[PDB]
PDB file of all heavy atoms in Angstrom:
ATOM      1  N   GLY X   7     -75.051 -37.678  -0.711  1.00 60.11           N
ATOM      2  CA  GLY X   7     -74.759 -38.392  -1.888  1.00 60.11           C
ATOM      3  C   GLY X   7     -73.200 -38.369  -2.215  1.00 60.11           C
ATOM      4  O   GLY X   7     -72.823 -37.631  -3.129  1.00 60.11           O
ATOM      5  N   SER X   8     -72.481 -39.272  -1.632  1.00 61.89           N
ATOM      6  CA  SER X   8     -71.091 -39.279  -1.852  1.00 61.89           C
ATOM      7  C   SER X   8     -70.604 -40.689  -2.253  1.00 61.89           C
ATOM      8  O   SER X   8     -69.540 -41.167  -1.807  1.00 61.89           O
ATOM      9  CB  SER X   8     -70.236 -38.947  -0.525  1.00 61.89           C
ATOM     10  OG  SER X   8     -70.666 -39.775   0.591  1.00 61.89           O
ATOM     11  N   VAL X   9     -71.328 -41.275  -3.108  1.00 60.33           N
ATOM     12  CA  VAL X   9     -71.141 -42.675  -3.604  1.00 60.33           C
ATOM     13  C   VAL X   9     -71.515 -42.678  -5.070  1.00 60.33           C
ATOM     14  O   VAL X   9     -72.763 -42.421  -5.445  1.00 60.33           O
ATOM     15  CB  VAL X   9     -71.880 -43.707  -2.858  1.00 60.33           C
ATOM     16  CG1 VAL X   9     -71.043 -44.171  -1.632  1.00 60.33           C
ATOM     17  CG2 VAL X   9     -73.253 -43.165  -2.359  1.00 60.33           C
ATOM     18  N   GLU X  10     -70.606 -43.129  -5.980  1.00 58.82           N
ATOM     19  CA  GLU X  10     -70.881 -43.243  -7.367  1.00 58.82           C
ATOM     20  C   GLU X  10     -70.294 -44.596  -7.857  1.00 58.82           C
ATOM     21  O   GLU X  10     -69.871 -44.753  -8.995  1.00 58.82           O
ATOM     22  CB  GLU X  10     -70.273 -42.155  -8.206  1.00 58.82           C
ATOM     23  CG  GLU X  10     -70.570 -40.854  -7.624  1.00 58.82           C
ATOM     24  CD  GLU X  10     -71.944 -40.292  -8.264  1.00 58.82           C
ATOM     25  OE1 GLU X  10     -72.855 -40.968  -8.368  1.00 58.82           O
ATOM     26  OE2 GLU X  10     -71.867 -38.995  -8.661  1.00 58.82           O
ATOM     27  N   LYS X  11     -70.349 -45.613  -7.095  1.00 59.05           N
ATOM     28  CA  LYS X  11     -69.899 -46.950  -7.382  1.00 59.05           C
ATOM     29  C   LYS X  11     -71.046 -47.988  -7.548  1.00 59.05           C
ATOM     30  O   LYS X  11     -72.129 -47.888  -6.869  1.00 59.05           O
ATOM     31  CB  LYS X  11     -68.972 -47.500  -6.261  1.00 59.05           C
ATOM     32  CG  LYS X  11     -67.664 -46.731  -6.231  1.00 59.05           C
ATOM     33  CD  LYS X  11     -67.807 -45.394  -5.391  1.00 59.05           C
ATOM     34  CE  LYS X  11     -66.613 -44.907  -4.815  1.00 59.05           C
ATOM     35  NZ  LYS X  11     -65.757 -44.067  -5.826  1.00 59.05           N
ATOM     36  N   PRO X  12     -70.972 -48.975  -8.393  1.00 58.30           N
ATOM     37  CA  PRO X  12     -71.951 -49.980  -8.629  1.00 58.30           C
ATOM     38  C   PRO X  12     -72.143 -50.829  -7.398  1.00 58.30           C
ATOM     39  O   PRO X  12     -72.929 -51.840  -7.421  1.00 58.30           O
ATOM     40  CB  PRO X  12     -71.266 -50.691  -9.814  1.00 58.30           C
ATOM     41  CG  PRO X  12     -69.909 -50.561  -9.751  1.00 58.30           C
ATOM     42  CD  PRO X  12     -69.648 -49.177  -9.237  1.00 58.30           C
ATOM     43  N   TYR X  13     -71.364 -50.706  -6.366  1.00 61.01           N
ATOM     44  CA  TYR X  13     -71.478 -51.386  -5.123  1.00 61.01           C
ATOM     45  C   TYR X  13     -71.402 -50.725  -3.839  1.00 61.01           C
ATOM     46  O   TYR X  13     -70.752 -49.520  -3.897  1.00 61.01           O
ATOM     47  CB  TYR X  13     -70.295 -52.464  -5.101  1.00 61.01           C
ATOM     48  CG  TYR X  13     -70.270 -53.455  -6.411  1.00 61.01           C
ATOM     49  CD1 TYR X  13     -69.231 -53.246  -7.337  1.00 61.01           C
ATOM     50  CD2 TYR X  13     -71.101 -54.401  -6.474  1.00 61.01           C
ATOM     51  CE1 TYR X  13     -69.206 -54.155  -8.356  1.00 61.01           C
ATOM     52  CE2 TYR X  13     -71.111 -55.287  -7.602  1.00 61.01           C
ATOM     53  CZ  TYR X  13     -70.146 -55.138  -8.553  1.00 61.01           C
ATOM     54  OH  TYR X  13     -70.114 -55.946  -9.623  1.00 61.01           O
ATOM     55  N   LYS X  14     -72.189 -51.067  -2.895  1.00 64.60           N
ATOM     56  CA  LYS X  14     -72.265 -50.288  -1.551  1.00 64.60           C
ATOM     57  C   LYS X  14     -72.485 -51.211  -0.496  1.00 64.60           C
ATOM     58  O   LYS X  14     -73.295 -52.130  -0.545  1.00 64.60           O
ATOM     59  CB  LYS X  14     -73.248 -49.263  -1.711  1.00 64.60           C
ATOM     60  CG  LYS X  14     -74.686 -49.853  -1.663  1.00 64.60           C
ATOM     61  CD  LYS X  14     -75.670 -48.705  -1.599  1.00 64.60           C
ATOM     62  CE  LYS X  14     -75.805 -47.842  -2.847  1.00 64.60           C
ATOM     63  NZ  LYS X  14     -76.444 -46.663  -2.801  1.00 64.60           N
ATOM     64  N   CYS X  15     -71.810 -51.049   0.695  1.00 65.47           N
ATOM     65  CA  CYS X  15     -72.014 -51.842   1.812  1.00 65.47           C
ATOM     66  C   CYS X  15     -73.420 -51.752   2.389  1.00 65.47           C
ATOM     67  O   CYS X  15     -73.892 -50.664   2.542  1.00 65.47           O
ATOM     68  CB  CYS X  15     -70.946 -51.534   2.980  1.00 65.47           C
ATOM     69  SG  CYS X  15     -71.083 -52.434   4.561  1.00 65.47           S
ATOM     70  N   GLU X  16     -74.084 -52.835   2.633  1.00 64.75           N
ATOM     71  CA  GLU X  16     -75.404 -52.825   3.094  1.00 64.75           C
ATOM     72  C   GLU X  16     -75.449 -52.709   4.687  1.00 64.75           C
ATOM     73  O   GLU X  16     -76.398 -53.109   5.306  1.00 64.75           O
ATOM     74  CB  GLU X  16     -76.087 -54.163   2.767  1.00 64.75           C
ATOM     75  CG  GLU X  16     -76.862 -53.986   1.394  1.00 64.75           C
ATOM     76  CD  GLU X  16     -77.163 -55.447   0.836  1.00 64.75           C
ATOM     77  OE1 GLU X  16     -76.482 -56.429   1.268  1.00 64.75           O
ATOM     78  OE2 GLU X  16     -78.026 -55.545   0.071  1.00 64.75           O
ATOM     79  N   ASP X  17     -74.321 -52.113   5.186  1.00 63.64           N
ATOM     80  CA  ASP X  17     -74.182 -51.924   6.631  1.00 63.64           C
ATOM     81  C   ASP X  17     -73.936 -50.345   6.990  1.00 63.64           C
ATOM     82  O   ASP X  17     -74.698 -49.958   7.746  1.00 63.64           O
ATOM     83  CB  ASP X  17     -73.143 -52.790   7.275  1.00 63.64           C
ATOM     84  CG  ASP X  17     -73.112 -53.019   8.704  1.00 63.64           C
ATOM     85  OD1 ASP X  17     -73.309 -52.001   9.470  1.00 63.64           O
ATOM     86  OD2 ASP X  17     -73.329 -54.274   9.077  1.00 63.64           O
ATOM     87  N   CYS X  18     -73.077 -49.771   6.215  1.00 61.32           N
ATOM     88  CA  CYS X  18     -72.736 -48.253   6.374  1.00 61.32           C
ATOM     89  C   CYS X  18     -73.207 -47.598   5.169  1.00 61.32           C
ATOM     90  O   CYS X  18     -73.702 -46.505   5.404  1.00 61.32           O
ATOM     91  CB  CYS X  18     -71.276 -48.201   6.771  1.00 61.32           C
ATOM     92  SG  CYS X  18     -70.178 -49.111   5.546  1.00 61.32           S
ATOM     93  N   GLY X  19     -72.910 -48.122   4.040  1.00 61.44           N
ATOM     94  CA  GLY X  19     -73.230 -47.378   2.813  1.00 61.44           C
ATOM     95  C   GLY X  19     -71.978 -46.917   2.080  1.00 61.44           C
ATOM     96  O   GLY X  19     -72.119 -45.972   1.303  1.00 61.44           O
ATOM     97  N   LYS X  20     -70.938 -47.558   2.366  1.00 61.81           N
ATOM     98  CA  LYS X  20     -69.663 -47.221   1.682  1.00 61.81           C
ATOM     99  C   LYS X  20     -69.803 -47.427   0.126  1.00 61.81           C
ATOM    100  O   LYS X  20     -70.766 -47.980  -0.354  1.00 61.81           O
ATOM    101  CB  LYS X  20     -68.437 -47.907   2.220  1.00 61.81           C
ATOM    102  CG  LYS X  20     -67.820 -47.329   3.427  1.00 61.81           C
ATOM    103  CD  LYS X  20     -67.118 -46.049   3.158  1.00 61.81           C
ATOM    104  CE  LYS X  20     -65.710 -46.363   2.855  1.00 61.81           C
ATOM    105  NZ  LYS X  20     -65.540 -46.713   1.350  1.00 61.81           N
ATOM    106  N   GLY X  21     -68.764 -46.944  -0.612  1.00 63.61           N
ATOM    107  CA  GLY X  21     -68.711 -47.120  -2.121  1.00 63.61           C
ATOM    108  C   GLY X  21     -67.460 -47.850  -2.496  1.00 63.61           C
ATOM    109  O   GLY X  21     -66.269 -47.410  -2.079  1.00 63.61           O
ATOM    110  N   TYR X  22     -67.654 -48.795  -3.399  1.00 60.56           N
ATOM    111  CA  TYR X  22     -66.556 -49.634  -3.859  1.00 60.56           C
ATOM    112  C   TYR X  22     -66.710 -49.940  -5.384  1.00 60.56           C
ATOM    113  O   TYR X  22     -67.746 -50.547  -5.726  1.00 60.56           O
ATOM    114  CB  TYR X  22     -66.128 -50.855  -3.076  1.00 60.56           C
ATOM    115  CG  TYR X  22     -65.673 -50.722  -1.726  1.00 60.56           C
ATOM    116  CD1 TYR X  22     -66.393 -50.636  -0.574  1.00 60.56           C
ATOM    117  CD2 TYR X  22     -64.241 -50.280  -1.657  1.00 60.56           C
ATOM    118  CE1 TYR X  22     -65.798 -50.443   0.647  1.00 60.56           C
ATOM    119  CE2 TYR X  22     -63.673 -50.039  -0.445  1.00 60.56           C
ATOM    120  CZ  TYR X  22     -64.419 -50.149   0.735  1.00 60.56           C
ATOM    121  OH  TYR X  22     -63.940 -49.843   1.942  1.00 60.56           O
ATOM    122  N   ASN X  23     -65.773 -49.554  -6.319  1.00 64.38           N
ATOM    123  CA  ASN X  23     -65.883 -49.905  -7.659  1.00 64.38           C
ATOM    124  C   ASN X  23     -65.399 -51.262  -7.925  1.00 64.38           C
ATOM    125  O   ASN X  23     -65.114 -51.682  -9.024  1.00 64.38           O
ATOM    126  CB  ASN X  23     -65.006 -48.986  -8.444  1.00 64.38           C
ATOM    127  CG  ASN X  23     -65.647 -48.574  -9.805  1.00 64.38           C
ATOM    128  OD1 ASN X  23     -64.923 -48.862 -10.817  1.00 64.38           O
ATOM    129  ND2 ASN X  23     -66.762 -48.188  -9.843  1.00 64.38           N
ATOM    130  N   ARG X  24     -65.267 -52.091  -6.904  1.00 64.33           N
ATOM    131  CA  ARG X  24     -64.851 -53.471  -7.066  1.00 64.33           C
ATOM    132  C   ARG X  24     -65.569 -54.427  -6.079  1.00 64.33           C
ATOM    133  O   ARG X  24     -66.070 -54.007  -4.984  1.00 64.33           O
ATOM    134  CB  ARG X  24     -63.294 -53.626  -6.774  1.00 64.33           C
ATOM    135  CG  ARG X  24     -62.461 -53.442  -7.956  1.00 64.33           C
ATOM    136  CD  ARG X  24     -60.963 -53.751  -7.574  1.00 64.33           C
ATOM    137  NE  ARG X  24     -60.295 -52.653  -6.881  1.00 64.33           N
ATOM    138  CZ  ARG X  24     -59.854 -51.609  -7.629  1.00 64.33           C
ATOM    139  NH1 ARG X  24     -60.007 -51.343  -8.886  1.00 64.33           N
ATOM    140  NH2 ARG X  24     -59.202 -50.583  -6.903  1.00 64.33           N
ATOM    141  N   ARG X  25     -65.774 -55.684  -6.587  1.00 62.02           N
ATOM    142  CA  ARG X  25     -66.517 -56.667  -5.851  1.00 62.02           C
ATOM    143  C   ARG X  25     -65.755 -57.086  -4.514  1.00 62.02           C
ATOM    144  O   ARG X  25     -66.291 -56.755  -3.405  1.00 62.02           O
ATOM    145  CB  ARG X  25     -66.838 -57.907  -6.573  1.00 62.02           C
ATOM    146  CG  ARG X  25     -68.223 -57.797  -7.285  1.00 62.02           C
ATOM    147  CD  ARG X  25     -69.354 -58.029  -6.433  1.00 62.02           C
ATOM    148  NE  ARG X  25     -69.727 -59.564  -6.362  1.00 62.02           N
ATOM    149  CZ  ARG X  25     -70.376 -60.097  -5.374  1.00 62.02           C
ATOM    150  NH1 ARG X  25     -70.871 -59.316  -4.339  1.00 62.02           N
ATOM    151  NH2 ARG X  25     -70.629 -61.378  -5.322  1.00 62.02           N
ATOM    152  N   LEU X  26     -64.553 -57.554  -4.780  1.00 60.69           N
ATOM    153  CA  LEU X  26     -63.734 -58.032  -3.611  1.00 60.69           C
ATOM    154  C   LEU X  26     -63.610 -56.902  -2.535  1.00 60.69           C
ATOM    155  O   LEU X  26     -64.001 -57.137  -1.394  1.00 60.69           O
ATOM    156  CB  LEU X  26     -62.369 -58.395  -4.157  1.00 60.69           C
ATOM    157  CG  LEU X  26     -61.435 -59.174  -3.137  1.00 60.69           C
ATOM    158  CD1 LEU X  26     -60.439 -59.960  -3.976  1.00 60.69           C
ATOM    159  CD2 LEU X  26     -60.847 -58.323  -2.110  1.00 60.69           C
ATOM    160  N   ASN X  27     -63.209 -55.760  -3.004  1.00 61.97           N
ATOM    161  CA  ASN X  27     -63.119 -54.638  -1.959  1.00 61.97           C
ATOM    162  C   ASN X  27     -64.158 -54.752  -0.879  1.00 61.97           C
ATOM    163  O   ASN X  27     -63.964 -54.428   0.230  1.00 61.97           O
ATOM    164  CB  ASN X  27     -63.047 -53.363  -2.642  1.00 61.97           C
ATOM    165  CG  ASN X  27     -61.688 -53.086  -3.422  1.00 61.97           C
ATOM    166  OD1 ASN X  27     -60.679 -53.830  -3.236  1.00 61.97           O
ATOM    167  ND2 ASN X  27     -61.583 -52.050  -4.080  1.00 61.97           N
ATOM    168  N   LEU X  28     -65.419 -54.971  -1.409  1.00 64.09           N
ATOM    169  CA  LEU X  28     -66.550 -54.949  -0.651  1.00 64.09           C
ATOM    170  C   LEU X  28     -66.557 -56.198   0.281  1.00 64.09           C
ATOM    171  O   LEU X  28     -66.551 -56.150   1.524  1.00 64.09           O
ATOM    172  CB  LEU X  28     -67.880 -55.044  -1.455  1.00 64.09           C
ATOM    173  CG  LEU X  28     -69.159 -55.368  -0.696  1.00 64.09           C
ATOM    174  CD1 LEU X  28     -69.509 -54.354   0.380  1.00 64.09           C
ATOM    175  CD2 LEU X  28     -70.301 -55.440  -1.803  1.00 64.09           C
ATOM    176  N   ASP X  29     -66.607 -57.417  -0.287  1.00 60.80           N
ATOM    177  CA  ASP X  29     -66.560 -58.673   0.446  1.00 60.80           C
ATOM    178  C   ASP X  29     -65.574 -58.549   1.511  1.00 60.80           C
ATOM    179  O   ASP X  29     -65.900 -58.980   2.725  1.00 60.80           O
ATOM    180  CB  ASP X  29     -66.147 -59.855  -0.461  1.00 60.80           C
ATOM    181  CG  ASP X  29     -66.046 -61.107   0.145  1.00 60.80           C
ATOM    182  OD1 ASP X  29     -66.741 -61.348   1.223  1.00 60.80           O
ATOM    183  OD2 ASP X  29     -65.405 -62.072  -0.284  1.00 60.80           O
ATOM    184  N   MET X  30     -64.397 -58.024   1.376  1.00 60.96           N
ATOM    185  CA  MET X  30     -63.406 -57.791   2.432  1.00 60.96           C
ATOM    186  C   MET X  30     -63.733 -56.683   3.367  1.00 60.96           C
ATOM    187  O   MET X  30     -63.481 -56.798   4.602  1.00 60.96           O
ATOM    188  CB  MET X  30     -62.029 -57.643   1.747  1.00 60.96           C
ATOM    189  CG  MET X  30     -61.381 -58.837   1.364  1.00 60.96           C
ATOM    190  SD  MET X  30     -59.465 -58.793   1.295  1.00 60.96           S
ATOM    191  CE  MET X  30     -58.945 -60.189   2.188  1.00 60.96           C
ATOM    192  N   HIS X  31     -64.272 -55.634   2.815  1.00 60.18           N
ATOM    193  CA  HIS X  31     -64.624 -54.453   3.629  1.00 60.18           C
ATOM    194  C   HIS X  31     -65.491 -54.845   4.813  1.00 60.18           C
ATOM    195  O   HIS X  31     -65.170 -54.466   5.912  1.00 60.18           O
ATOM    196  CB  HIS X  31     -65.472 -53.542   2.592  1.00 60.18           C
ATOM    197  CG  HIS X  31     -66.244 -52.574   3.504  1.00 60.18           C
ATOM    198  ND1 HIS X  31     -65.682 -51.339   3.904  1.00 60.18           N
ATOM    199  CD2 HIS X  31     -67.535 -52.578   3.920  1.00 60.18           C
ATOM    200  CE1 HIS X  31     -66.713 -50.684   4.700  1.00 60.18           C
ATOM    201  NE2 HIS X  31     -67.786 -51.393   4.606  1.00 60.18           N
ATOM    202  N   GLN X  32     -66.502 -55.701   4.549  1.00 59.38           N
ATOM    203  CA  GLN X  32     -67.356 -56.154   5.725  1.00 59.38           C
ATOM    204  C   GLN X  32     -66.513 -56.325   6.888  1.00 59.38           C
ATOM    205  O   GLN X  32     -67.065 -56.167   8.049  1.00 59.38           O
ATOM    206  CB  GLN X  32     -67.998 -57.405   5.297  1.00 59.38           C
ATOM    207  CG  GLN X  32     -69.305 -57.272   4.461  1.00 59.38           C
ATOM    208  CD  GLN X  32     -70.326 -56.546   5.286  1.00 59.38           C
ATOM    209  OE1 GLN X  32     -70.293 -56.477   6.581  1.00 59.38           O
ATOM    210  NE2 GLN X  32     -71.446 -56.041   4.674  1.00 59.38           N
ATOM    211  N   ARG X  33     -65.234 -56.859   6.776  1.00 56.49           N
ATOM    212  CA  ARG X  33     -64.389 -56.941   7.965  1.00 56.49           C
ATOM    213  C   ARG X  33     -64.614 -55.996   8.972  1.00 56.49           C
ATOM    214  O   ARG X  33     -64.762 -56.195  10.164  1.00 56.49           O
ATOM    215  CB  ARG X  33     -62.937 -57.073   7.476  1.00 56.49           C
ATOM    216  CG  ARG X  33     -62.482 -58.398   7.077  1.00 56.49           C
ATOM    217  CD  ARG X  33     -61.031 -58.561   6.817  1.00 56.49           C
ATOM    218  NE  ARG X  33     -60.252 -58.365   8.048  1.00 56.49           N
ATOM    219  CZ  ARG X  33     -58.832 -58.182   8.167  1.00 56.49           C
ATOM    220  NH1 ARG X  33     -58.223 -58.079   6.958  1.00 56.49           N
ATOM    221  NH2 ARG X  33     -58.226 -58.151   9.314  1.00 56.49           N
ATOM    222  N   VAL X  34     -64.522 -54.773   8.585  1.00 55.32           N
ATOM    223  CA  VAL X  34     -64.533 -53.589   9.460  1.00 55.32           C
ATOM    224  C   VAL X  34     -65.734 -53.811  10.409  1.00 55.32           C
ATOM    225  O   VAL X  34     -65.608 -53.531  11.741  1.00 55.32           O
ATOM    226  CB  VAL X  34     -64.997 -52.278   8.676  1.00 55.32           C
ATOM    227  CG1 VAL X  34     -63.770 -51.896   7.733  1.00 55.32           C
ATOM    228  CG2 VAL X  34     -66.256 -52.373   7.921  1.00 55.32           C
ATOM    229  N   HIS X  35     -66.796 -54.362  10.002  1.00 53.83           N
ATOM    230  CA  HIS X  35     -67.948 -54.716  10.771  1.00 53.83           C
ATOM    231  C   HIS X  35     -67.776 -55.904  11.530  1.00 53.83           C
ATOM    232  O   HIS X  35     -68.879 -56.654  11.590  1.00 53.83           O
ATOM    233  CB  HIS X  35     -69.323 -54.563  10.046  1.00 53.83           C
ATOM    234  CG  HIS X  35     -69.400 -53.441   9.246  1.00 53.83           C
ATOM    235  ND1 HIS X  35     -69.615 -52.094   9.645  1.00 53.83           N
ATOM    236  CD2 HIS X  35     -69.299 -53.318   7.822  1.00 53.83           C
ATOM    237  CE1 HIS X  35     -69.717 -51.309   8.682  1.00 53.83           C
ATOM    238  NE2 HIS X  35     -69.515 -51.958   7.485  1.00 53.83           N
ATOM    239  N   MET X  36     -66.548 -56.285  11.963  1.00 51.13           N
ATOM    240  CA  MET X  36     -66.266 -57.519  12.721  1.00 51.13           C
ATOM    241  C   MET X  36     -66.126 -57.374  14.144  1.00 51.13           C
ATOM    242  O   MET X  36     -66.518 -58.172  14.931  1.00 51.13           O
ATOM    243  CB  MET X  36     -65.149 -58.241  12.046  1.00 51.13           C
ATOM    244  CG  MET X  36     -63.836 -57.475  12.306  1.00 51.13           C
ATOM    245  SD  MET X  36     -63.069 -57.949  13.868  1.00 51.13           S
ATOM    246  CE  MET X  36     -62.612 -59.657  13.514  1.00 51.13           C
ATOM    247  N   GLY X  37     -65.497 -56.136  14.511  1.00 53.37           N
ATOM    248  CA  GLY X  37     -65.294 -55.902  15.980  1.00 53.37           C
ATOM    249  C   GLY X  37     -65.518 -54.471  16.332  1.00 53.37           C
ATOM    250  O   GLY X  37     -66.396 -53.850  15.680  1.00 53.37           O
ATOM    251  N   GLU X  38     -64.827 -53.925  17.279  1.00 56.62           N
ATOM    252  CA  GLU X  38     -64.929 -52.607  17.799  1.00 56.62           C
ATOM    253  C   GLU X  38     -63.784 -52.028  18.355  1.00 56.62           C
ATOM    254  O   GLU X  38     -63.158 -52.681  19.136  1.00 56.62           O
ATOM    255  CB  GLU X  38     -66.127 -52.544  18.768  1.00 56.62           C
ATOM    256  CG  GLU X  38     -65.951 -53.310  20.017  1.00 56.62           C
ATOM    257  CD  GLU X  38     -65.994 -54.795  19.760  1.00 56.62           C
ATOM    258  OE1 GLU X  38     -66.970 -55.315  19.326  1.00 56.62           O
ATOM    259  OE2 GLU X  38     -64.930 -55.456  20.029  1.00 56.62           O
ATOM    260  N   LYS X  39     -63.441 -50.781  17.914  1.00 54.38           N
ATOM    261  CA  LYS X  39     -62.201 -50.149  18.361  1.00 54.38           C
ATOM    262  C   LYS X  39     -62.186 -50.160  19.876  1.00 54.38           C
ATOM    263  O   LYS X  39     -63.092 -49.638  20.513  1.00 54.38           O
ATOM    264  CB  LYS X  39     -62.141 -48.703  17.818  1.00 54.38           C
ATOM    265  CG  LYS X  39     -63.300 -47.857  18.275  1.00 54.38           C
ATOM    266  CD  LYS X  39     -63.416 -46.629  17.372  1.00 54.38           C
ATOM    267  CE  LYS X  39     -62.475 -45.547  17.637  1.00 54.38           C
ATOM    268  NZ  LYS X  39     -63.043 -44.574  18.780  1.00 54.38           N
ATOM    269  N   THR X  40     -60.981 -50.694  20.417  1.00 53.45           N
ATOM    270  CA  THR X  40     -60.980 -50.671  21.934  1.00 53.45           C
ATOM    271  C   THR X  40     -60.022 -49.495  22.361  1.00 53.45           C
ATOM    272  O   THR X  40     -58.834 -49.517  22.139  1.00 53.45           O
ATOM    273  CB  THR X  40     -60.215 -51.962  22.382  1.00 53.45           C
ATOM    274  OG1 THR X  40     -58.804 -52.032  21.745  1.00 53.45           O
ATOM    275  CG2 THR X  40     -61.077 -53.163  21.898  1.00 53.45           C
TER     276      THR X  40
END
Side-chain angles (χ1 to χ4, degrees):
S8 56
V9 270
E10 308 270 46
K11 295 79 155 86
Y13 302 108
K14 72 174 69 193
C15 181
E16 270 162 337
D17 203 301
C18 50
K20 275 289 272 88
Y22 285 105
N23 210 240
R24 270 188 281 281
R25 270 281 273 160
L26 198 155
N27 282 355
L28 165 63
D29 181 24
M30 278 206 131
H31 161 88
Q32 274 295 347
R33 272 188 72 193
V34 298
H35 313 286
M36 69 86 67
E38 60 291 301
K39 61 201 276 273
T40 62

